[PDB]
Ligand binder design. Structure first.
Ligand SMILES: [Mg+2]
Ligand SMILES: [Mg+2]
Ligand SMILES: [Mg+2]
Ligand SMILES: [Mg+2]
Ligand SMILES: [Mg+2]
Ligand SMILES: [Mg+2]
Ligand SMILES: [Mg+2]
Ligand SMILES: [Mg+2]
Ligand SMILES: [Mg+2]
Ligand SMILES: [Mg+2]
Ligand SMILES: [Mg+2]
Ligand SMILES: [Mg+2]
Ligand SMILES: [Mg+2]
Ligand SMILES: [Mg+2]
Ligand SMILES: [Mg+2]
Ligand SMILES: [Mg+2]
Ligand SMILES: [Mg+2]
Ligand SMILES: [Mg+2]
Ligand SMILES: [Mg+2]
Ligand SMILES: [Mg+2]
Ligand SMILES: [Mg+2]
Ligand SMILES: [Mg+2]
Ligand SMILES: [Mg+2]
Ligand SMILES: [Mg+2]
Ligand SMILES: [Mg+2]
Ligand SMILES: [Mg+2]
Ligand SMILES: [Mg+2]
Ligand SMILES: [Mg+2]
Ligand SMILES: [Mg+2]
Ligand SMILES: [Mg+2]
Ligand SMILES: [Mg+2]
Ligand SMILES: [Mg+2]
Ligand SMILES: [Mg+2]
Ligand SMILES: [Mg+2]
Ligand SMILES: [Mg+2]
Ligand SMILES: [Mg+2]
Ligand SMILES: [Mg+2]
Ligand SMILES: [Mg+2]
Ligand SMILES: [Mg+2]
Ligand SMILES: [Mg+2]
Ligand SMILES: [Mg+2]
Ligand SMILES: [Mg+2]
Ligand SMILES: [Mg+2]
Ligand SMILES: [Mg+2]
Ligand SMILES: [Mg+2]
Ligand SMILES: [Mg+2]
Ligand SMILES: [Mg+2]
Ligand SMILES: [Mg+2]
Ligand SMILES: [Mg+2]
Ligand SMILES: [Mg+2]
Ligand SMILES: [Mg+2]
Ligand SMILES: [Mg+2]
Ligand SMILES: [Mg+2]
Ligand SMILES: [Mg+2]
Ligand SMILES: [Mg+2]
Ligand SMILES: [Mg+2]
Ligand SMILES: [Mg+2]
Ligand SMILES: [Mg+2]
Ligand SMILES: [Mg+2]
Ligand SMILES: [Mg+2]
Ligand SMILES: [Mg+2]
Ligand SMILES: [Mg+2]
Ligand SMILES: [Mg+2]
Ligand SMILES: [Mg+2]
Ligand SMILES: [Mg+2]
Ligand SMILES: [Mg+2]
Ligand SMILES: [Mg+2]
Ligand SMILES: [Mg+2]
Lengths: 50, 251, 68, 108, 80, 50
RNA sequence: UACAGGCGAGAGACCGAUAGCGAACAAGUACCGCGAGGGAAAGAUGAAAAGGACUUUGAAAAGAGAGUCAAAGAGUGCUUG
RNA sequence: GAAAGAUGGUGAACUAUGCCUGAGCGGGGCGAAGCCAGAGGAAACUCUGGUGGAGGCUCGAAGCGAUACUGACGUGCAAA
RNA sequence: GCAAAUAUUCAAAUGAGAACUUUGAAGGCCGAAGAGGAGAAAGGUUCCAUGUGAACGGCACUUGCACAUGGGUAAGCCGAUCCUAAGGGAAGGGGUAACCCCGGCAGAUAGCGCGAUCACGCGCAUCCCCGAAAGGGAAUCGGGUUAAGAUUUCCCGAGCCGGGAUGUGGCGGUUGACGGCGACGUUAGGAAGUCCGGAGACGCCGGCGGGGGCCUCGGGAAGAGUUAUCUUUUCUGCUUAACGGCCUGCCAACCCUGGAAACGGUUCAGCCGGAGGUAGGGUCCAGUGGCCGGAAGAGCACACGUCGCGCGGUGUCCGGUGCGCCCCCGGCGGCCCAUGAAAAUCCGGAGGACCGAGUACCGUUCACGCCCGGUCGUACUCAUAACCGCAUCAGGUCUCCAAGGUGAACAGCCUCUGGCCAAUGGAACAAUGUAGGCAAGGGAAGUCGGCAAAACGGAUCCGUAACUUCGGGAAAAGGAUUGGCUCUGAGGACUGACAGUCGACUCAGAACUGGUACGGACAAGGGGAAUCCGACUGUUUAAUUAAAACAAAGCAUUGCGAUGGUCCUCGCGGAUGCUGACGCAAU
RNA sequence: UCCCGUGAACCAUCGAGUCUUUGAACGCAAGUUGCGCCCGAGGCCAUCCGGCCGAGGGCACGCCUGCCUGGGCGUCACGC
């Protein structure tokens, strides 16, 4: 809602910083196995439950 | 089986009294030196309807005995009281309707209401609308008096028990038919959750001793003994007789 | 939002500390003299241009006069 | 004809959410919120209105907000008791005190 | 009816976030966490769910302080 | 209040008014209005923003 | 004397990615449930990225030539297959 | 490979009931007490015409529900 | 299989590629209880710009609520925050093996509060905390501004509230002001403990009256539309906020004089009067009423003329109307075995301990002036795609605003503002379906059964049986009428049995007229004679049962006078009970 | 500049340090960055040699040893 608490606004902010594709240079490091962000979230597909 | 409706009321949950709009308790004023040895003068200020109760209530304002302030009490109004009346409380008060006197100050045959039982309990008897007690006798070698209660029973009470002269106002209320489920609904909305009532014979066996059967019937005597367990004591508890009242037993 | 009625007291109130400005709105049929004070904006409506010019001169030099 | 909308985020039509339609210089119709009406002060003795005092919402009577002539009536018990109630109390005070002596005249 | 019509009426939260454990298990009306038992001083845990125990024992977080006690025990807790 | 103080110690200027908002990603942003003595553009130049 | 926890070791006629702990991998993770709780899948290019410049067709993805390599028909989910 | 039995916990965001504090329910029909006027009468009172607007009254809009087609659908738009 | 929610078409642009994107034109729909404009909950970046290979958007896409990169939420005045409701937690104490369970049980109950400090005094009563973004409540309005923020957070202008100080001026000392017969008036006008009152502060229903907004009529100036014919015509607009004064003074309430029968005054209704009417004259109250300031400098509409948030000009009127609609208010009436919160906060009073000058000090709720105003939310959707239903699901989910015509009507039907044409397209028109019609003669023969359909239907006039608890039945039944046009009569207002002017609405009646049509679409009872059950209204097996079941009023029985009855609890203890026989409890 | 040296390092190791908001969680609470009180280095004026904004830091509960303040004819002594 537009009326929210600071604590809920704080957690929603962090969830946004985590919806980003991995940097390209991570894919180049020695002995690397990360392919993609396996935790990306879409607001219409998976709800935060908080 | 399961816990029956009569057993569910003692837990309180939805069966507590509906008292949001009530006006406070109705009683005499704490008995003191003024009322033991003389009389205290009060003025009736308002006659008010108390939700959940048929007797009207009288707001009497006294002057404090030893503090510079008012004392605002609340009585069960006797029939006849009116705003602006001076009521008098105490031991030397005149025998007038609305006055509060101890029973040693009331002749036999007098009509009284809000009678105490222990000296200072501030009123336990004859408090419903149009109800009164009658002073039958005095026994001066005990400090006790015999009164007749609304039920007809004769109780011996101290000669210092206070009472209000007259009868409780609002009498005759229950002579009017209600005619409607709706009128019963509004009556109980302000009292407690006891209405409507489903007959036990219309229940299933799991929730009532009378329940079940291919026809609605009790199937056992409806009179149950006094010492029956809770959940079993439904019907006519410890009944001495049943059937229509005739002759002497109706007296 | 507080109208003055006389040149006399308007001069006194335009001669106050924190009189920031005086505005002069020449209108139809009249001229308005508004003085910007701390709490209120005071207004005279002057009807004689001769009395209008006389008022202008007594406005004490320093008091910001705007012509619109 | 321009339907309107609330200007607060209180969206229900309670007594506190009172609106008035006004036409502003911009050619617009808007809602503006209003006070909810208060009864004014009353005399307990007779229930009647107290004269000479406006009917305002209780914080609107604060000393910092209303001039003292709008808050007071220049008589004993003023703004608390109406005129007749004062007159009755005076006579009753006087007469009953005069009755106190004529009962004490009987003490012989 | 039950089912689709009745699922449309989820609008009110029975649980919200808990300050002590962080899970959406704080029952607002009852005012206690169903997971950790807050505000009870002791933590809610049972031996009839060993799996729930191991989700929240020591070592599943940082051990901000107890991480270094092994190193301090060696060298018998020297203070400089 | 502290924003007003700190902008006087640093940049040696005066804030007529400070308005704040916590941005959607978690940081706070302060809009500082300079008292009409100082010039915002000249303050902008002395640090380098424009 | 005891010691499925903690920390630090050493072993084995044990298992060999559907096995062995649920988890060899950002696994008590993703995801589900209001909740208590439930709970996966998923390892292997090459010795070395040397991970395919350039030309040509195509809007592109790609194809056809070519180039690297012992090998690409080992071509970034790629040993065998 | 049960139907069960036990121990200890979690739910009234759906639904049940009580309590508190808010919001909401066109236009029509019938026409109870009370009241006014005229007429009749020894009286008691009656009669006539209005007025008025009662009621878990009535047709019905929104809302709330769910009788019938045992209609459609019945690997549905939909676990109603 | 892609079929509900009426619907698309033509040109052009773009592009590799257009039924699906964009602009223009046309044709349609929602039709305002909306497919319009905004919110509460819930979501969490979906908002906005730029770009984009795959995937995804059940056809497609240049496209997007997808993907990538950036940007975006501004408050002393809106909220939260403060107060209490139902209710929750809780210290000493009681119980408990312990986790835990008990709040009135009354304990040096937590907190002491107030005047004082230069120390002491007083008082301590039903007592702490939490609990409402719909209850209570310090204070804001108008105009601008963005790709995206603000209607009131930003800019321009104009105010207000709370706290803190302090100064100039004023006001009083008959110590603590004047005026009025009075109701009361004047923006100043001592006051300590203590006490008292008011507001906050309250149900539903009915009608009547008032204000604002809208709708509606006529006139004037501005622009536009129609114009072969007409049409002084049709369309659009012609604005003025909080706040500050002055006026006005509704309906009530109140004051003074006076003394009422031959009773009068009065409402739609009531009602009022020797406890003082009618009358005459005053006070006060409400206001979203009028004037001025704000404020024309703003906004809007025209017409001009110029390079770049240019500039200049014209105007921003006049009456009238109401069983109209929305909101609010006033004041009466009705209803109840129902009487329809609290507290914070603010205001007023009773009393009068104690206090000072007049070379001046004690004041003061006045005016002006000075400073300060913290924290968190604020974008966007609010739903036939942003919430829940495993989905971009014909489901479900609380509100505010609400135009014209027809009409009783927020019915249905058509239209304007605003919004859309999003539901994969093309061809053809077999059977069988599904949804919707019509059918000669007959008219329930069909079928378990009139299931389904048809028939009836609005309004005005007339007429209406059995039976009855005398209230009904009843819209019983049964009849007649209904368009258009041209007239006639009645029913009013104000101003000076009259004269003049004005006037929106209803009802009666007549002649003429038509291919006998006329509640012309829409909307909208079929009726009657009986039997059984339940008296009625009400309720019920969410998702196979709506009933004859449940409830109910009425009737009757039973227990109980408190050291009690019925009931809950492991215990402590508790519910009924803020109760007490016209009551509680059990049938 | 870190390369024959105070000297690189996603080095190892550990003694010196830092350690946001919470949590038994402790000033009162909590779907609140909500609501109090106390101290106070530093700076300003003077409405005092006081008052204003302060950097930082306190204020939970039960308990033990000591202490300070106090209460009650509970038991006394001594008085008045
Ligand atoms: Mg969803
Ligand atoms: Mg009930
Ligand atoms: Mg009964
Ligand atoms: Mg029953
Ligand atoms: Mg049954
Ligand atoms: Mg049984
Ligand atoms: Mg039976
Ligand atoms: Mg049966
Ligand atoms: Mg038998
Ligand atoms: Mg309202
Ligand atoms: Mg006054
Ligand atoms: Mg169920
Ligand atoms: Mg609900
Ligand atoms: Mg709940
Ligand atoms: Mg803010
Ligand atoms: Mg495995
Ligand atoms: Mg596994
Ligand atoms: Mg090979
Ligand atoms: Mg190979
Ligand atoms: Mg190999
Ligand atoms: Mg292979
Ligand atoms: Mg088994
Ligand atoms: Mg068994
Ligand atoms: Mg519920
Ligand atoms: Mg709920
Ligand atoms: Mg309710
Ligand atoms: Mg009905
Ligand atoms: Mg009906
Ligand atoms: Mg149905
Ligand atoms: Mg249906
Ligand atoms: Mg069917
Ligand atoms: Mg089928
Ligand atoms: Mg096919
Ligand atoms: Mg289909
Ligand atoms: Mg509406
Ligand atoms: Mg977008
Ligand atoms: Mg597709
Ligand atoms: Mg609170
Ligand atoms: Mg609130
Ligand atoms: Mg509110
Ligand atoms: Mg501004
Ligand atoms: Mg004076
Ligand atoms: Mg009150
Ligand atoms: Mg209320
Ligand atoms: Mg008069
Ligand atoms: Mg006004
Ligand atoms: Mg004006
Ligand atoms: Mg309405
Ligand atoms: Mg009334
Ligand atoms: Mg906002
Ligand atoms: Mg917004
Ligand atoms: Mg909407
Ligand atoms: Mg779900
Ligand atoms: Mg009409
Ligand atoms: Mg209509
Ligand atoms: Mg036929
Ligand atoms: Mg047949
Ligand atoms: Mg047949
Ligand atoms: Mg047959
Ligand atoms: Mg047959
Ligand atoms: Mg049918
Ligand atoms: Mg009949
Ligand atoms: Mg007619
Ligand atoms: Mg029935
Ligand atoms: Mg069913
Ligand atoms: Mg059914
Ligand atoms: Mg029944
Ligand atoms: Mg008892």
């Amino acid at each position: 809602p537009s009326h929210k608490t600071f604590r809920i606004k704080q957690k929603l902010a962090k969830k946004q910083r985590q919806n980003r594709p991995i940097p390209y240079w991570i894919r180049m490091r020695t002995d690397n196995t990360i392919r993609y962000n396996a935790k990306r979230r879409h607001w219409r597909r998976t709800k935060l439950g908080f | 089986g399961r816990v029956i409706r009569a057993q569910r009321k003692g837990a309180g949950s939805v069966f507590k009294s509906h008292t949001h709009h009530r006006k406070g308790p109705a009683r005499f004023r704490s008995l003191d030196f003024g009322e033991r040895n003389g009389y205290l003068k009060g003025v009736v200020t308002d006659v008010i309807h108390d939700p959940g109760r048929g007797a009207p209530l009288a707001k009497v304002t006294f002057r404090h005995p030893f503090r510079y302030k008012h004392q605002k009490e609340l009585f069960v109004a006797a029939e006849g009281m009116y705003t602006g009346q001076f009521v008098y409380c105490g031991r030397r008060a005149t025998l007038s309707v609305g006055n509060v006197l101890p029973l040693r100050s009331v002749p036999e045959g007098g009509v009284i209401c809000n009678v105490e039982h222990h000296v200072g309990d501030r009123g336990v008897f004859a408090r419903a609308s149009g109800d009164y007690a009658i002073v039958i006798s005095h026994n001066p070698d005990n400090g006790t008096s015999r009164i007749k209660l609304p039920s007809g029973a004769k109780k011996i009470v101290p000669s210092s028990c206070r009472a209000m002269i007259g009868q409780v106002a609002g009498g005759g209320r229950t002579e009017k038919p209600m005619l409607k489920a709706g009128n019963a609904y509004h009556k109980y909305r302000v009292k407690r959750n006891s209405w409507p009532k489903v007959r036990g014979v219309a229940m299933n066996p799991v929730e009532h001793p009378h329940g079940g059967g291919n026809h609605q019937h009790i199937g056992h005597a409806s009179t149950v003994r006094r010492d029956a367990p809770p959940g079993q004591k439904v019907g006519l508890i410890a009944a001495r007789r049943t059937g229509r009242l005739r002759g002497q037993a109706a007296a | 939002p507080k109208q003055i009625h006389e040149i006399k007291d308007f001069l006194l109130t335009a001669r106050r500390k924190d009189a920031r400005s005086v505005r002069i709105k020449r209108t139809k049929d009249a001229v308005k003299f508004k003085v910007r004070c701390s709490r209120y904006l005071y207004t005279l409506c002057v009807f004689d241009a001769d009395k209008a010019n006389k008022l202008k001169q007594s406005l004490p030099p320093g008091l910001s006069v705007q012509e619109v | 004809v321009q339907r309107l909308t609330y200007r607060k985020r209180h969206s229900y039509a309670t007594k506190s959410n009172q609106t008035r339609v006004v036409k502003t210089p911009g050619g617009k119709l808007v809602y503006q919120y209003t006070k909810k009406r208060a009864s004014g002060p009353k005399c307990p003795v007779t229930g009647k209105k107290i004269q000479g005092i406006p009917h305002l919402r209780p914080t609107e009577y604060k000393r910092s907000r209303l001039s003292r002539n709008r808050r007071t009536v220049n008589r004993p018990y003023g703004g608390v008791l109406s005129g007749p109630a004062v007159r009755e109390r005076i006579i009753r005070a006087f007469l009953v005190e005069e009755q106190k002596i004529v009962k004490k005249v009987l003490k012989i | 009816t039950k089912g689709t019509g009745s699922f449309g009426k989820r609008r009110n939260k029975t649980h919200t976030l808990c300050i002590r454990c962080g899970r959406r298990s704080f029952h607002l009306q009852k005012s206690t966490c169903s997971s950790c038992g807050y505000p009870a001083a002791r933590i809610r845990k049972y031996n009839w769910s060993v799996k729930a125990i191991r989700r929240k024992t020591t070592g599943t977080g940082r051990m901000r302080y107890m991480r270094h006690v092994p190193r301090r025990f060696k060298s018998n807790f020297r203070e400089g | 209040k502290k924003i007003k103080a700190a902008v006087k110690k640093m940049y040696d200027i005066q804030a007529k008014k400070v308005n704040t908002l916590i941005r959607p990603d978690g940081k706070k942003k302060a809009y500082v209005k300079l008292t009409p003595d100082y010039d915002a553009l000249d303050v902008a130049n002395k640090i380098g923003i424009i």
